[PDB]
Design a protein around this ligand. Structure first.
Ligand code: I0U
Length: 110
């Protein structure tokens, strides 16, 4: 990994760490729409994303730069904000995890 992608990988590790588990856990795995009874999910969300997918892509060297990584993390949050009413718990959890993400992403080395 490039220096910037090392920083990205560090962030990803943090987002998956026990430190943030109380609000990160809905983002660990793909939304299983059928299992959760969300029969409209894939009509509304055209491009699902979650942290396990981001992790697989990082491990497989799919991301060519930090921007591509960040786009997937933000897609995951955007999907949450798109699908869910803003007063649902999962949205509050997304906002908190995105705060973690954005503040550390901003510390990207040049
Ligand atoms: C609607 C709402 O506020 N919540 C609270 C948090 C959990 C959500 C349901 N859910 C999701 C989930 C659902 C939606 C709609 C979503 O956008 N994300 C990101 C995760 N992933 C889950 C994995 C497992 Br195991 C058990 C329950 C899970 C219900």
């Amino acid at each position: 990994l490039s220096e910037q992608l090392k920083h990205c990988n560090g962030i990803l590790k943090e987002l998956l760490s026990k430190k943030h588990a109380a609000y990160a856990w809905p983002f660990y795995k793909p939304v299983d729409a059928s299992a959760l009874g969300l029969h409209d999910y894939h009509d509304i969300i055209k491009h699902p994303m979650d942290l396990s997918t981001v992790k697989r892509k990082m491990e497989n060297r799919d991301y060519r730069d930090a921007q591509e990584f960040a786009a997937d993390v933000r897609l995951m949050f955007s999907n949450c904000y798109k699908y869910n009413p803003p007063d649902h718990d999962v949205v509050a959890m997304a906002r908190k995890l995105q705060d973690v993400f954005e503040f550390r992403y901003a510390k990207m080395p040049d």
